[PDB]
Amino acid sequence: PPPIADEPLTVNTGIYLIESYSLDDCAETFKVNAFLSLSWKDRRLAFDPVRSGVRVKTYEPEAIWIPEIRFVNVENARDADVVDISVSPDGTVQYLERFSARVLSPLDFRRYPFDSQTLHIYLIVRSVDTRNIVLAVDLEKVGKNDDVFLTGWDIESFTAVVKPANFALEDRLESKLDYQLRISRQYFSYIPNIILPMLFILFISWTAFWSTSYEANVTLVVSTLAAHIAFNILVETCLPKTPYMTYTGAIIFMIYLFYFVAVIEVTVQHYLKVESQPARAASITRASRIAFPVVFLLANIILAFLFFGF
Amino acid sequence: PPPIADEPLTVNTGIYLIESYSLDDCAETFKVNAFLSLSWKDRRLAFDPVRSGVRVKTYEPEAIWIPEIRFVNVENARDADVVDISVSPDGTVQYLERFSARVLSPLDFRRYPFDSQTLHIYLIVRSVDTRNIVLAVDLEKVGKNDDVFLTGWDIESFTAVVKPANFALEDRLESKLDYQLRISRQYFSYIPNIILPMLFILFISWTAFWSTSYEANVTLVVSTLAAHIAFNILVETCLPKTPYMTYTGAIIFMIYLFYFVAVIEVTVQHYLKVESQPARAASITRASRIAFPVVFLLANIILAFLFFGF
Amino acid sequence: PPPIADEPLTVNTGIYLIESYSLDDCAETFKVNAFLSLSWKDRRLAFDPVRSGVRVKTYEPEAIWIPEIRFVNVENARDADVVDISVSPDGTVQYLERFSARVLSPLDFRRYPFDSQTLHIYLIVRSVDTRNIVLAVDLEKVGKNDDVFLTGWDIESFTAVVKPANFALEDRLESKLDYQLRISRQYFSYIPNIILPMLFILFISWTAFWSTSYEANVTLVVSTLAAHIAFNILVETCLPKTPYMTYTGAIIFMIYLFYFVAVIEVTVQHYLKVESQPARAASITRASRIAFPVVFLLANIILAFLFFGF
Amino acid sequence: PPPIADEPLTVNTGIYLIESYSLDDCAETFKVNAFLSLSWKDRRLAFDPVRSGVRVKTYEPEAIWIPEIRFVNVENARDADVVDISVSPDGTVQYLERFSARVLSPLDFRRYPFDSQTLHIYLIVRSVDTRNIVLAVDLEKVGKNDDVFLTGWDIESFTAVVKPANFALEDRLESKLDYQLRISRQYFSYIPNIILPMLFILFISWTAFWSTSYEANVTLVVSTLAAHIAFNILVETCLPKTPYMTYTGAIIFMIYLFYFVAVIEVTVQHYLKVESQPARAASITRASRIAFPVVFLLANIILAFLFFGF
Amino acid sequence: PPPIADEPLTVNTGIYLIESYSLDDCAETFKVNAFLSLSWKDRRLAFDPVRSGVRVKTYEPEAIWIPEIRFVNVENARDADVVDISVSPDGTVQYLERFSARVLSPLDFRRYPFDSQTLHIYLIVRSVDTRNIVLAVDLEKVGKNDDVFLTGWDIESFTAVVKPANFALEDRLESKLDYQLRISRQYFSYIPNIILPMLFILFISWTAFWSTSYEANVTLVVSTLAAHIAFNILVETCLPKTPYMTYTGAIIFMIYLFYFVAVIEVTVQHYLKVESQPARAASITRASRIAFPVVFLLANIILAFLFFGF
Ligand code: NA
């Protein structure tokens, strides 16, 4: 029984983050726990305060026509507790619920793990005898609470795209709204735990350039190589399978290349020194001592530029 | 309370993908979030002047006879929210709910990870005093909304098989409808993370063909074998146990054969060269230097043709 | 209000498999999704169609006395949606529901992974003013559906055991029924992924019998040993801890023994060869080249017979 | 509306284990599926059979005052099926439900994996206006079904502590009952999968006592040590973090000590034998050949006695 | 419809811990099972005992107005079981429910695993026709049960912060209450499973200082480095990614540094000694023999002071 109107019905929306948590990169989901607040004109609910007795009268959801607001990018239907309903004299309805949902928003891993992300919560509503369009009351958005934390990330800002994408679907009109939680990853821990160990075992690997022991050099380069495969696996598992190339995915691959050519070099210099050609062998190795670090640093300049430098 | 039955009751169906997600290859399941739309006329509901109050009015599920539509290949009963019910002047009812389900559809892994799949959602309806058959209205199907993504996959098409399978079951006849979501896997990340590294360690394996140090050659070939075993494990765990052979299963197995014969050879050349036959030893190893890559490349040609080329 | 009869009430049962899936060997559980069909006579519900108006009438569960059937070997109570209730003129009630549950049935791992299993679904009912016995109607126990698949398994047959187990419980008598779905495992994928790799790494181990290189033979034997531990762990984790010995458990163990006496031999031939006794060492070694394959093939014949051969 | 009493109300309890399963050593939880039987006199319910149709009449839960009995050491409130309620003429009520709960009882891991455990189910009832005390009818306590099995454990006995702990809580008194399910771990599988391999690689380690090859002795001892760390990890993951010391925890730690002094010996004999001091070196090694197994066997007797022998 | 008020309604609170469990460090959550006790005056409930029959009357939650108390840092709405409601003649209501929830509270990992934590449970209530303030009755908060155990942790205390935080939210005010469960972790098992083995393989690593065998020293240092990579991984995974530096993270990283400088050194001493400079090389290792343990112990004093010494 929507409010009988001479005009299209605006439902005012606002979301107060109380808790957000469980950002799942493999799933590309996160879990949020918040207030949802709705506001609208139902003049059928208009009462005269003085004669009816009181400043606001309160119903239970069963009593009133309430718009069916739905989350678009949500997995299973939301859980909500209706915290309050209030009608002001002129028929102004104040709805307040507390919900929790895991919403599904895609992620961009190209600058992983130095990425920043923008999570979206989309509210849609579907019209009937009066049409519904939604819009945002920014004072009842108040952002998040000041204890709101998302483990492993920095919350940059929580705002809403002020007013909606209105479109046709299955013969009726729908109005969609976009609330946006921007986060930046805390990359710190990747450094002592992933990047630096990788670097170390790579450097250890080419330590085989001030050596002339084939019988040992093979041992070195393949040891370090194994450890790097372990790191590749460790990293790969806690990420989704992306159709594009990431920054540390790039680094990791580039490293496999350095290991392969290192192996090649090692092999060549040994073949040479058994072909009674120690001059040319030793000069290849001395080249490598300069080549490998320099071409590495260069490749990394190019690479970092290619990812972040645009 | 079935509808006055002058005819077999047609229920018009449609599914609108809002979200699909969590394709589980070990499970052969995926999760869908969609509009389900049902429509039929119940002439008992027919009132048809705009009289005495409204053009079309809305009842709630408990007031009306609703065909009980069920998904065949789902795990638990679906979780559904009824979005609206509208009854038309001759009692033409349009039912709209929003559900989420994890649907269970088999997958074909033979051309993994270059496989494509066609997921199924099967709807049955079951009869009584009149017979029910289902069918599809394509406006209320239109597939996905074009924001639908399934991580790690490209969504090709969402269609429905227009004609139902109407068949006998126990007491009464049932009507089944087949909606089909075709997807193709995004193989990109498999190359830098699995195939290329696999290849590299196989090649480093063959580097022992330009060496005569048994004591180190063994080190080489068993090391690389180890990393292959690790890769075999990594890949194999995250797939189900298929009764058939997959493409990268074929590849991985072939690679085992190459490692085993490599080892055999290494052993042979050291045994010969301690059995005082360095001519024949050096000729067998040098032979292998050409042999192994070529038998590898053509074996892969045979294999690729054997899989994709048919 | 149970049906007042003369003496003991037969409630006719039938189960139609719709989906079965998620066999968990560590849990020894699996998930089933099926029709449950019940039938019994309540002569109080008997109506004659001439005066009552219709050929058969249908109630809702609260309208009728319905026997409460329960599954014995189930984790949490199955949850079901009732498809229909029909009473025949003579008071014959035909009940039909659709349930899904994970039923808990034990497994025999002695011939893993070449095992076959017999899954059970047990139905219980509890009596009062009339005695209840359950029995099976085979015509609407039309078995299973032909799209029914259980991943990694072949479904051999689905039938039910015709006479119930009637016994005293909590001082009233209960009636129990046994439906049993026999499956046989699909071992195919175990061969290229576990067994053949196991064998290979074992043979590569025995390559140390054509080497006089301790310095390397040690490398060979502990390397392969390690890979065999990785395979052991891999196989072992996806199994429960059985109080008995499994077939591949036996194999894996025997393999450990082979690795140990191999190490021993290597140790011995090196000590002999430095103890200035190359004669007995080399003859011990040539012995081993013959012994190890032969005692392996023998032990495996013995074992294969010991398990499968009785 | 409790039965108005001239005395404290005894509610008679009994629990019938139908299924038990999912013992979690990390969580220290397990899952149970059982009958709960309650009984009390509500003299207000007293009816005499002479008046009405039947000797005992049956109600449904909403009609009657039913005591709220709760499991104390359970995670979330149990979910139950009320199977039957019968009031006998003297107003004697027999209540029967079938529940499933995962109950939380601590475990003692000191003799792992040769420990036995005592699982608990605690029932409380909280009085009001009259006193409620719980007590046990052993005739209605089953112990278990004759098919009740708990994977990886031997179920010894299910009994109950007959007199309750009745105590003050938040100003009213509660009555607690303690049911005790005794189990013994089935350790068989630990021997072929964990204990014996672990020992073997320890022995293989000690092969370096018959070697005099530093490069190979080192190869040996670090290889074996690697596998022992892998085993330590393997075991450690499936146990919780106890403030005390477990048995295989002790053994495993001891083994680490053996590997360390082993390495020390190896390094020492190499150093002596390069200090042109083969006398001292070879005599230390010959010593170790006897020393290591003996100090091991002793350490292990002292250990076992220290654990099980008290 | 709160009790008509002349002034702010105080709702008196209390929490009795029955079970707490599943402390998750990656999630930074834990699970609790407790009594929640609420008490307030609603004078509309005032009764004459004599005329009405009973000194205290008990309702069920629907009959009465009950204040909506909600938990702030919880994931989903708690699951609650309402155990009692008792009203006193003067309209004083005693509410008692048994709830279970996983509450989300942040953790400080800087002194891991020698950290202590203060877990929080925050209760809020929100106002309407009258305002609610919550407050704590310390007796109905009679601490914890002394069978309350938290695996892997020692429970220090359970208390409540006596004064509420009363603040404005969304145009009406809320009253927040802070209960604090202080725990300290049980570090015992970290010593035999992580710290000592790490130390052992680091020492085993430094045995390469009494060895001029490059060909083996590489073997030593990189094998131990490998196992230490495994320890880093093991430890790291069971912790969340903190933006800051932890204590054992600090240690593990320092250890990587020691490995790198070790490799550097063995590499240089070998390079020197094949570069025909045996005096100074041997003096570099003789130095290292003292240097590495002493700089290690010194760095550890500085680090431990840096963490715990504040
Ligand atoms: Na080596």
From Swiss-Prot, chains A, B, C, D, E:
UniProt topological domain (Cytoplasmic) ranges: 210-212, 275-277
Short name of one Pfam family: Neur_chan_LBD
Membrane protein topology class: Multi-pass membrane protein
MF GO annotations: extracellular ligand-gated monoatomic ion channel activity; identical protein binding; potassium channel activity; sodium channel activity; transmembrane signaling receptor activity
Record annotation: effect of changing E215 to Q/D: Decreases binding affinity of TBA
Activity regulation note: Tetraethylammonium (TEA) and tetrabutylammonium (TBA) inhibit the proton-activated currents in a dose- and voltage-dependent manner in vitro, whereas the blocker of acid sensing ion channels, amiloride, has no effect. Channel current of GLIC can be inhibited by inhaled and intravenous general anesthetics at and below concentrations used clinically. Ion conduction is also inhibited by lidocaine and by divalent transition metal ions such as cadmium ions.
Compartments where located: Cell inner membrane
Regions of this protein lying in the Periplasmic compartment: 1-186, 238-245
Keywords recorded for this protein, A-Z: Cell inner membrane, Cell membrane, Ion channel, Ion transport, Ligand-gated ion channel, Membrane, Potassium, Potassium channel, Potassium transport, Receptor, Signal, Sodium, Sodium channel, Sodium transport, Transmembrane, Transmembrane helix, Transport
TM segment ranges: 187-209, 213-237, 246-274, 278-310
Impact upon substituting T219A: Increases the binding affinity of TBA. Weakens block by Cd(2+)
UniProt-listed InterPro entries: GABAA/Glycine_rcpt, Neur_chan_lig-bd, Neur_chan_lig-bd_sf, Neur_channel, Neuro-gated_channel_TM_sf, Neuro_actylchol_rec
GO CC field: plasma membrane
Entry domain remark: Consists of an N-terminal ligand-binding domain that encloses a wide aqueous vestibule and a transmembrane domain that forms a narrow channel.
Subunit text: Homopentamer.
Function as written in the Swiss-Prot or TrEMBL entry: Cationic channel with similar permeabilities for Na(+) and K(+), that is activated by an increase of the proton concentration on the extracellular side. Displays no permeability for chloride ions. Shows slow kinetics of activation, no desensitization and a single channel conductance of 8 pS. Might contribute to adaptation to external pH change.
Note: The homologous nature of GLIC to eukaryotic nicotinic acetylcholine receptors and other eukaryotic pentameric ligand-gated ion channels, and its sensitivity to general anesthetics, define GLIC as a structural and functional model of signal transduction in the nervous system, also relevant for exploring the molecular basis of anesthetic action.
Similarity comment: family membership: Belongs to the ligand-gated ion channel (TC 1.A.9) family.
Protein name: Proton-gated ion channel
The species this protein was found in: Gloeobacter violaceus (strain ATCC 29082 / PCC 7421)
